[PDB]
Amino acid sequence: RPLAISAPEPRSLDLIFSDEARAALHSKYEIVEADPENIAGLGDDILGRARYIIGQPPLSAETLARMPALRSILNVESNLLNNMPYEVLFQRGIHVVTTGQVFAEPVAEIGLGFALALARGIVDADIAFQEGTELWGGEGNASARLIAGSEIGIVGFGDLGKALRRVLSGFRARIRVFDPWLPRSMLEENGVEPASLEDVLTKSDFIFVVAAVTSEFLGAEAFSSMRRGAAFILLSRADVVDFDALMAAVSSGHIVAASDVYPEEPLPLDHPVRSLKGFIRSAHRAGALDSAFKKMGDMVLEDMDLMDRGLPPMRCKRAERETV
Amino acid sequence: RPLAISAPEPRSLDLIFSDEARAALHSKYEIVEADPENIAGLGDDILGRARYIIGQPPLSAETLARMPALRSILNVESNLLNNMPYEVLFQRGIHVVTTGQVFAEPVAEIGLGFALALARGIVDADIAFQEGTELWGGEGNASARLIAGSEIGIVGFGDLGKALRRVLSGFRARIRVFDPWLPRSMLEENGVEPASLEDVLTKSDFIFVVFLGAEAFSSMRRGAAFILLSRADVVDFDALMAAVSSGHIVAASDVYPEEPLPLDHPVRSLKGFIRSAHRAGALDSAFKKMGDMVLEDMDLMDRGLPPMRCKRAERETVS
Amino acid sequence: PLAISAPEPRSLDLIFSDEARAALHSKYEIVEADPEDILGRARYIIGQPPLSAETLARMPALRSILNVESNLLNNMPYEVLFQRGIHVVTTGQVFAEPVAEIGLGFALALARGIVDADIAFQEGTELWGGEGNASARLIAGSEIGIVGFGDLGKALRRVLSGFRARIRVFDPWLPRSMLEENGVEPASLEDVLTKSDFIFVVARFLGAEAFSSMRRGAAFILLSRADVVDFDALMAAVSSGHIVAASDVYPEEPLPLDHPVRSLKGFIRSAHRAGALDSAFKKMGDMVLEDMDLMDRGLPP
Amino acid sequence: ERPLAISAPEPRSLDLIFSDEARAALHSKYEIVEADPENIAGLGDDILGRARYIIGQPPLSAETLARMPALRSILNVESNLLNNMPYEVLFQRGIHVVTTGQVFAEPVAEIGLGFALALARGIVDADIAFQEGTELWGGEGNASARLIAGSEIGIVGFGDLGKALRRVLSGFRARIRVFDPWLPRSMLEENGVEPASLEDVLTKSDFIFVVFLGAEAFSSMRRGAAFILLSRADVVDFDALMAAVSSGHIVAASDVYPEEPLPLDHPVRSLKGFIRSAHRAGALDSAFKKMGDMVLEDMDLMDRGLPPMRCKRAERETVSR
């Protein structure tokens, strides 16, 4: 049986493997749990045979020079880490794979969720009824509106982009996407209309922010640029918008909105965002679902099985061209 | 040009018509507004020749035999009314048409809204965030799940079910449907999987309804979602309520037994429930369609064409 | 349970599978009649009789009429059926799928010279490249036109799903709204003929005027009913290299052994065989059977 | 000074793979040097030292490669890697080799579905019958004539071609089983297919597109099964296939063959139940044009320093194999 070192922290085997998957995994491999701060500490025997690393440990040239069978490192924190001589793991042919796309479907779903909540006031309609201020249907629907309509714009488009395009595929709506690093040919074939940020921002009833582009726009001036009763949905990275610029457009009652991410987390208790009518709130929980984490396990398993049978990993994301 | 009685019920011509289809109507038809409850007392020059009624007005045989012209009654209130002689219309060959399909999309749409909200605690995540109650990231999500790859069951299958099917498209869920009337082999070529009411209840994470209750609520899954969208008469409402209060299930409704509802009613106090004041279908875009749906049918029957557009009413006279 | 079986032209041996007659016996029972105890109590009817205003009043316990030969074999007591109540429906929809599939078939072959490249290969004269593909084009993203849109149009539209094309349909009967939600763009006949790369004909004369109107590379597929087509004009259009075409139906079926189409380069011929599949007849049973088990529940079909 | 690319596309050409709009963009944005594929070494040091891309598949030596410090990628326009390079020293330098083969998936898939309906329904024969006069009219003709709609379909392989084959089959709502052991089963499933063992595909499918395999393979298929072979004859026992076809066990269609061009002698030229195609499934002009368009899309990404995305990337293990 091939040997794999486990050093998944701050993730863990218990979290990322269903029973079925965990049994499959140990039935198939010797999985030695190991201290990530001390990989070098392992058996000079253990290091000689390791074909895989599940996780993201610190590593150095000398300890890496000790691992002649290492085939791949499977990153399970969604994020690449300035952690080890990537140059030599490239020289050697050693793939580094990531499992972050597990968080797409979770985030799409709750994302379409807010879209429908805003476009029909599902929340305000529940609180009003809850305490007792109806408007009994028809009378509620001043500002109601279908998504099937309908002009959708996506700011960014990676995995979260695609997951969203998928859930929306039942709405026969119009989907404008802005993305710098995807050719117009690839967008068109993903079922979307490649577009300027200004088109997306402007000719759109529903706007989703979904990926950074990059590193770090959309301020007071970007918001006014919108259509009147516009739906603006923030799913990734709060640092890209001016929050108070955004709140301003909401109280003003220009656009309507919902975010899952905030300029500070957790947000202080006194913070304005809490009282603002017309803004749906979500405590950075769009992606952390158990089943998302159990999927990481499945992926790892698929990718191991390919590399065991000599083939390149397919399932988790590869890395290459990223100095940082 | 030809003649049409305009007597819609709570629906007015204003509401169910955009300027476009409105101005195209007298432009195309001689149309006369008329008290819907006094339709016999319209001028007999009129009765004898008018060929379409746009409304749901009550009609007696006497008022009927004086409409030899009349080829269809076009109803703009979704549900057929025990209102007239539905036996003469048949011989006379008169069509009664329904425009009720226009509530399929908006209800589907808001149905997916509840499910995702039920599935993910959207509403009580928000209410909490108002009040400072919180729980960030993974702490809030103990019983938050995906709909994609989940098991959905529908009860009945209207236009509403076809509309629900369509919106679910991108979820790749297992769609079990239970519906007596429509032949087993017609759901198959419509996307969904035919199934006994048992499975639809016992083996669905999400159950949509488009008589029953109590034991049924106990036969449902671990922490499954009930989403109720039409015909309140079918659920024992207290049985649902306790089934919700127990914690055994989570639920959402757009229909209620007393409508409007008592201000005392305890549902409004009820954790694990999401309320809507019958607002699933009542959308201006929905209303405006009825109009165009009507014109299309009129124009069609003018050629003398058995209309395809609106819904018809065959052996559903028995009820 | 009672039903009347005047199948001919169609059999019962051949419009039901095993499980399908197996079930029709053990849930009903039936006759070996002649479309030209009984009279009164009869609930159903699997046939195409002219029977017959008098013989009708004699059958007062009737529910539904089941034409198992697509077309309505008139005459029934036309008005004393809708005034009386009894039900009139067809099985004709089973032919939709088979016609569609083979329609796409002809399209692809016209689109890529499949038949010509198999003949060439046989006769030793095939171009390999590259070089064999000068007129080869792709159906994907390509502007297809349909003329008519019955049960048939629908099936076509469905086998086309995965092609990603702009589909234009000319149909005066169906209201714009029904087509557009049904996945197609509604259009005027000119805007079809003139603006399509592949035109399919499904359901008083289409002639020389039209064929000149079509785009120069265009492909003309004829699937139902010759009558509305100027057969001569069609043959001149193809003959001149203006268009390529294909047709399952002809001015006269069978067609004379000496008919100039039998040797017209650019034209794919099929002998009125779009719809006649064994599986379509077997689906006929299912259809009537399921809709019987519905009628005897006070429900429509 | 604009980035320089070396063009050596033979057996293809710039005239063929670039359309007008695209060929102009290419020379606006790039300094394209046309080279003789057998002599890249001879180009100036001035060119070799400044070159950033190669369009085509020229034989290259570590020797030459060493003289190319700026080389970012080799954009291979024949669809197939050649063993004419030190693949070790690429990779090393992070020089990408990409492939333009995806332009074939769509044309190959349409003709593939076109071969299946031909088989399913005797389109070729029926036309030939009408030509000659012999001649069955609708019903007696369709004795051995099925739908694809309800059927069970099977795919051996699944790259771009499978995907395109899955797209065009989507209107038919069939059950599609596919064997691809280079894809993880989750990736198959999200692509709308049911992953399946080789022998299930072989034994449980009314239609089999190929996208080992000899007499036991053929004898295991269901009795009326159609077998559509679209890529690389390399993997069928062509003699067994013909035997299987002539006995009336299966009907079949191929666009590829054991020697190409075939000899005029060849048995498969006279064989019934076989639809023939002269390796033309994928060579359409519009297809060759799409290579120019991809090549340019990828050169753009790399000028911006991103990795390639529109063309497929040569992986150490493929080049190993």
Side-chain angles (χ1 to χ4, degrees):
Chain A
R1 292 148 17 101
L3 181 159
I5 306 178
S6 167
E9 354 275 3
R11 298 269 137 80
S12 76
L13 300 182
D14 283 294
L15 180 61
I16 64 157
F17 281 94
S18 75
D19 293 341
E20 182 183 58
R22 178 78 96 114
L25 170 74
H26 288 291
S27 176
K28 193 162 207 209
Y29 307 93
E30 321 175 17
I31 286 110
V32 6
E33 264 150 320
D35 169 12
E37 304 315 350
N38 181 222
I39 285 320
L42 262 7
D44 205 67
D45 172 34
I46 278 154
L47 296 157
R49 297 150 34 207
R51 168 174 310 169
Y52 308 111
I53 314 245
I54 316 173
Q56 328 77 53
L59 281 191
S60 72
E62 297 67 15
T63 142
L64 200 58
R66 286 212 272 150
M67 289 180 259
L70 190 57
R71 224 117 106 181
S72 160
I73 289 172
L74 303 94
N75 199 63
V76 293
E77 207 235 0
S78 44
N79 279 94
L80 249 44
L81 297 195
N82 197 20
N83 217 311
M84 48 185 141
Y86 285 99
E87 60 278 1
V88 11
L89 323 152
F90 261 137
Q91 176 81 50
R92 282 165 103 263
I94 302 319
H95 312 123
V96 176
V97 105
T98 44
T99 53
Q101 75 154 336
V102 303
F103 293 124
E105 189 55 58
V107 181
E109 296 199 1
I110 199 108
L112 178 34
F114 309 135
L116 301 163
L118 302 154
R120 304 290 282 277
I122 291 166
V123 179
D124 22 75
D126 187 58
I127 290 156
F129 196 127
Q130 217 209 305
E131 65 202 12
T133 69
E134 313 317 338
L135 280 316
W136 246 86
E139 281 290 43
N141 303 156
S143 339
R145 195 233 149 105
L146 319 85
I147 289 190
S150 185
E151 302 257 49
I152 299 152
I154 308 173
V155 175
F157 190 95
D159 293 317
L160 221 326
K162 304 176 203 172
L164 199 22
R165 172 49 180 89
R166 188 161 59 259
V167 300
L168 297 159
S169 64
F171 289 75
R172 288 92 175 110
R174 176 144 156 132
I175 303 165
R176 279 188 205 89
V177 168
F178 166 75
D179 195 61
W181 332 291
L182 211 65
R184 300 175 132 262
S185 136
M186 310 218 75
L187 287 177
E188 285 165 15
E189 282 144 357
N190 266 256
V192 297
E193 188 176 325
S196 341
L197 210 167
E198 327 297 327
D199 294 331
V200 165
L201 205 160
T202 259
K203 329 192 154 140
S204 275
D205 297 297
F206 304 96
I207 302 143
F208 296 89
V209 196
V210 137
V213 281
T214 351
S215 224
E216 306 210 4
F217 43 118
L218 318 165
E221 197 270 293
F223 286 110
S224 45
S225 147
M226 268 168 211
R227 263 175 203 170
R228 178 59 188 154
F232 173 93
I233 305 150
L234 183 62
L235 298 164
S236 60
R237 217 68 196 121
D239 64 26
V240 309
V241 297
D242 188 287
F243 224 93
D244 335 73
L246 165 80
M247 295 195 64
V250 205
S251 46
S252 86
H254 190 224
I255 44 93
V256 85
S259 175
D260 193 61
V261 68
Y262 294 89
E264 195 199 337
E265 295 163 351
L267 214 56
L269 313 121
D270 83 287
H271 205 283
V273 189
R274 313 197 175 237
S275 72
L276 195 70
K277 91 289 164 66
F279 188 100
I280 288 163
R281 283 144 304 251
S282 212
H284 208 333
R285 62 203 221 108
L289 267 50
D290 181 55
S291 71
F293 291 115
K294 301 304 193 224
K295 251 203 279 142
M296 295 214 268
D298 300 319
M299 291 177 50
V300 169
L301 236 23
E302 281 164 326
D303 276 348
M304 275 174 105
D305 176 52
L306 291 151
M307 305 200 258
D308 290 322
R309 302 186 330 246
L311 311 143
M314 291 310 279
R315 194 16 154 184
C316 312
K317 194 204 266 210
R318 217 112 110 205
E320 343 76 317
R321 222 105 176 90
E322 287 118 12
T323 321
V324 258
Chain B
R1 264 218 171 175
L3 185 61
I5 314 288
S6 163
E9 228 147 36
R11 275 43 182 275
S12 82
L13 292 191
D14 314 354
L15 176 58
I16 68 153
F17 277 98
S18 63
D19 302 29
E20 180 62 79
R22 197 98 156 88
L25 175 61
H26 334 268
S27 183
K28 199 152 180 162
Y29 301 94
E30 183 196 352
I31 64 166
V32 261
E33 294 203 29
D35 174 354
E37 219 209 306
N38 184 48
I39 290 302
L42 222 37
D44 208 295
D45 73 286
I46 296 174
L47 255 80
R49 69 194 180 94
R51 267 197 305 98
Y52 303 119
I53 303 168
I54 298 149
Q56 305 73 47
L59 282 194
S60 56
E62 329 295 83
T63 322
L64 225 142
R66 296 193 283 143
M67 286 177 124
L70 197 76
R71 283 178 284 197
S72 176
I73 313 168
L74 294 68
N75 126 298
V76 302
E77 218 296 68
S78 40
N79 42 57
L80 220 73
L81 260 170
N82 205 35
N83 230 342
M84 50 203 195
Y86 285 95
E87 58 280 10
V88 60
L89 324 165
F90 244 98
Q91 277 73 307
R92 246 324 98 223
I94 323 293
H95 308 119
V96 196
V97 310
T98 308
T99 54
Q101 99 145 344
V102 312
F103 298 140
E105 215 152 16
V107 182
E109 283 214 9
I110 209 188
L112 190 36
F114 307 131
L116 281 151
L118 242 10
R120 274 150 102 8
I122 294 164
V123 166
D124 58 284
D126 193 63
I127 293 167
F129 209 110
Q130 298 220 225
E131 304 168 352
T133 305
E134 267 13 292
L135 274 60
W136 281 74
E139 266 104 53
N141 290 121
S143 64
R145 75 180 270 85
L146 290 171
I147 290 174
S150 68
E151 279 158 277
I152 321 294
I154 303 171
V155 163
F157 196 82
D159 269 347
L160 187 38
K162 154 103 197 215
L164 225 47
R165 178 54 186 80
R166 197 172 61 241
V167 309
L168 297 174
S169 298
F171 286 97
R172 358 181 182 288
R174 191 175 169 172
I175 296 174
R176 277 192 267 259
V177 163
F178 169 77
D179 175 358
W181 309 347
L182 295 46
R184 140 169 292 269
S185 126
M186 256 199 70
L187 326 179
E188 253 212 57
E189 46 145 293
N190 201 42
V192 297
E193 170 178 355
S196 77
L197 155 142
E198 182 97 300
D199 316 310
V200 182
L201 295 155
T202 343
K203 285 194 226 75
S204 286
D205 306 299
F206 294 98
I207 128 81
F208 289 89
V209 172
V210 297
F211 294 70
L212 133 132
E215 109 291 2
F217 293 113
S218 207
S219 59
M220 280 172 200
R221 273 232 184 93
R222 192 39 273 170
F226 190 59
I227 330 286
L228 174 49
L229 308 177
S230 87
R231 227 57 209 82
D233 72 278
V234 167
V235 44
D236 179 293
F237 233 86
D238 318 38
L240 165 56
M241 215 137 308
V244 165
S245 304
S246 42
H248 177 76
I249 69 165
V250 117
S253 194
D254 183 69
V255 275
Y256 296 85
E258 177 87 303
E259 284 190 357
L261 198 60
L263 184 57
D264 197 2
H265 195 277
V267 74
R268 314 150 160 268
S269 187
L270 186 62
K271 285 186 37 147
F273 204 107
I274 276 162
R275 313 113 190 115
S276 215
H278 208 113
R279 17 177 300 108
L283 250 72
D284 200 279
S285 316
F287 291 134
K288 312 303 194 208
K289 282 209 78 172
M290 266 162 174
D292 312 46
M293 275 192 85
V294 162
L295 283 65
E296 286 172 18
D297 272 304
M298 266 166 337
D299 184 286
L300 196 58
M301 275 181 298
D302 287 325
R303 308 138 143 66
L305 291 192
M308 351 242 210
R309 184 89 197 94
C310 279
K311 215 195 79 150
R312 228 191 170 266
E314 312 175 48
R315 311 282 43 80
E316 47 183 337
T317 167
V318 171
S319 325
Chain C
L2 187 158
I4 314 182
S5 140
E8 288 85 294
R10 315 274 114 93
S11 110
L12 291 149
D13 291 296
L14 255 133
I15 85 158
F16 280 91
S17 54
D18 319 315
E19 221 157 7
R21 60 188 67 89
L24 173 81
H25 283 141
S26 331
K27 213 171 186 184
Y28 299 91
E29 228 199 329
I30 14 59
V31 323
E32 340 288 298
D34 222 13
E36 33 260 4
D37 59 325
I38 310 312
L39 32 102
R41 62 149 173 189
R43 293 147 89 205
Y44 303 134
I45 203 161
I46 326 171
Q48 317 75 353
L51 284 157
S52 162
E54 283 325 326
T55 33
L56 171 131
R58 301 155 72 263
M59 338 141 140
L62 192 74
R63 270 156 173 163
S64 63
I65 259 158
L66 299 167
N67 191 294
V68 285
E69 188 263 333
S70 290
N71 298 69
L72 272 157
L73 281 199
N74 305 329
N75 253 87
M76 263 88 150
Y78 211 47
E79 20 285 322
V80 78
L81 282 166
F82 92 115
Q83 159 178 350
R84 160 143 186 210
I86 302 144
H87 271 322
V88 107
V89 275
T90 328
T91 70
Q93 175 215 308
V94 296
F95 296 142
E97 188 59 20
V99 180
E101 284 206 355
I102 201 164
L104 187 44
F106 301 136
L108 286 146
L110 258 21
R112 307 260 251 112
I114 287 181
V115 197
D116 313 311
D118 195 31
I119 292 150
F121 205 102
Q122 265 163 279
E123 313 197 325
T125 82
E126 73 285 2
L127 298 160
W128 282 74
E131 12 177 349
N133 264 319
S135 304
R137 78 157 300 158
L138 226 52
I139 295 171
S142 76
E143 284 187 283
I144 291 137
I146 319 169
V147 165
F149 201 90
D151 275 341
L152 184 32
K154 288 184 202 212
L156 240 78
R157 160 55 207 183
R158 183 173 73 263
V159 280
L160 287 187
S161 312
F163 289 80
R164 187 150 227 176
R166 189 202 220 277
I167 299 164
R168 289 172 174 83
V169 178
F170 180 74
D171 200 336
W173 285 17
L174 286 101
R176 237 169 26 197
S177 141
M178 289 246 89
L179 307 163
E180 63 205 348
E181 278 144 37
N182 197 325
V184 305
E185 142 155 12
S188 83
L189 187 49
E190 281 73 18
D191 227 333
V192 183
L193 299 186
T194 181
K195 308 215 57 165
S196 329
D197 294 295
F198 294 95
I199 310 160
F200 293 79
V201 189
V202 310
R204 201 248 311 212
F205 254 91
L206 256 169
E209 54 249 22
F211 295 119
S212 281
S213 127
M214 295 179 327
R215 287 194 193 152
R216 160 85 179 156
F220 182 85
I221 296 73
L222 179 55
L223 288 166
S224 65
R225 309 164 48 189
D227 43 295
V228 290
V229 192
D230 192 338
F231 23 76
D232 290 312
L234 171 64
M235 285 193 48
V238 172
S239 205
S240 46
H242 197 65
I243 62 157
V244 300
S247 163
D248 195 43
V249 291
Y250 302 85
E252 183 180 12
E253 29 228 30
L255 189 83
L257 276 132
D258 51 48
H259 191 282
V261 92
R262 305 222 186 224
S263 58
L264 191 44
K265 189 85 175 187
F267 192 107
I268 297 172
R269 325 139 188 99
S270 250
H272 206 356
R273 39 191 258 114
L277 262 52
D278 195 37
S279 71
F281 293 120
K282 304 302 168 171
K283 179 102 175 174
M284 253 180 349
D286 304 7
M287 257 175 106
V288 295
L289 201 74
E290 295 165 0
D291 281 64
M292 263 177 173
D293 179 78
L294 258 78
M295 302 255 71
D296 56 32
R297 287 207 287 263
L299 300 170
Chain D
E1 296 316 91
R2 327 166 282 155
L4 178 165
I6 288 162
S7 176
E10 0 254 317
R12 310 247 199 261
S13 83
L14 314 172
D15 294 332
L16 175 75
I17 73 173
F18 283 94
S19 85
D20 274 4
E21 193 173 313
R23 191 70 182 279
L26 174 88
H27 302 268
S28 216
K29 184 155 203 154
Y30 305 84
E31 179 188 10
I32 283 88
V33 180
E34 296 209 6
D36 148 38
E38 280 311 317
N39 175 43
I40 291 291
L43 292 167
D45 234 50
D46 184 295
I47 285 171
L48 296 158
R50 216 158 39 85
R52 198 140 111 194
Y53 304 117
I54 282 168
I55 306 171
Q57 322 64 37
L60 280 169
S61 60
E63 148 72 37
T64 309
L65 228 66
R67 287 163 64 210
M68 295 185 280
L71 167 69
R72 219 171 279 175
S73 167
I74 292 153
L75 294 101
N76 171 91
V77 285
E78 218 273 320
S79 313
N80 312 291
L81 310 177
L82 279 37
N83 193 23
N84 59 338
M85 264 193 263
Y87 283 81
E88 329 87 56
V89 32
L90 311 167
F91 298 136
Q92 216 94 305
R93 311 169 47 190
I95 294 182
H96 316 267
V97 20
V98 299
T99 257
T100 188
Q102 185 183 315
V103 290
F104 300 127
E106 208 168 17
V108 180
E110 306 199 14
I111 205 81
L113 167 75
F115 291 157
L117 296 147
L119 299 184
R121 273 168 152 273
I123 290 178
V124 176
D125 342 323
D127 178 73
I128 269 136
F130 211 113
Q131 230 158 310
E132 70 192 316
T134 68
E135 205 12 34
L136 291 330
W137 284 76
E140 317 162 48
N142 299 104
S144 48
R146 61 171 309 142
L147 255 42
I148 300 197
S151 56
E152 276 160 280
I153 304 195
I155 322 179
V156 177
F158 201 84
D160 291 304
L161 195 38
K163 273 160 92 172
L165 214 36
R166 169 73 233 256
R167 205 153 65 245
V168 299
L169 294 165
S170 71
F172 293 86
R173 314 192 276 166
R175 161 161 189 198
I176 303 164
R177 278 196 205 91
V178 4
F179 178 65
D180 184 354
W182 293 11
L183 256 5
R185 106 178 89 133
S186 94
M187 234 151 158
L188 275 191
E189 274 148 2
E190 291 145 10
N191 233 297
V193 304
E194 177 184 341
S197 88
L198 211 203
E199 58 90 6
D200 285 281
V201 160
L202 291 167
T203 59
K204 297 189 156 274
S205 309
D206 302 317
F207 302 88
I208 296 137
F209 299 86
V210 181
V211 130
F212 75 126
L213 276 193
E216 29 136 9
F218 307 121
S219 28
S220 71
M221 310 182 188
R222 300 192 195 157
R223 195 195 135 73
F227 178 81
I228 327 269
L229 176 83
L230 299 164
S231 68
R232 320 171 56 209
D234 254 352
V235 294
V236 284
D237 180 349
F238 230 90
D239 296 351
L241 168 52
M242 288 212 275
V245 152
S246 125
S247 35
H249 191 35
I250 75 206
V251 299
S254 177
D255 179 68
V256 300
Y257 302 82
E259 194 192 315
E260 285 181 6
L262 255 207
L264 308 90
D265 292 296
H266 197 105
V268 76
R269 289 182 193 272
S270 62
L271 181 45
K272 323 83 159 300
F274 212 101
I275 305 188
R276 292 149 215 99
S277 209
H279 207 171
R280 37 194 251 122
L284 266 42
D285 180 71
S286 90
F288 290 117
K289 289 321 175 200
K290 295 209 167 146
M291 298 178 174
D293 285 356
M294 282 209 285
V295 168
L296 223 61
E297 257 168 8
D298 270 351
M299 272 177 286
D300 192 85
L301 272 36
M302 302 181 55
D303 291 336
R304 305 200 249 125
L306 294 137
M309 260 155 187
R310 220 197 141 177
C311 299
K312 207 216 316 143
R313 317 229 270 97
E315 261 142 8
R316 217 170 306 238
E317 305 87 304
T318 314
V319 320
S320 213
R321 167 56 189 84

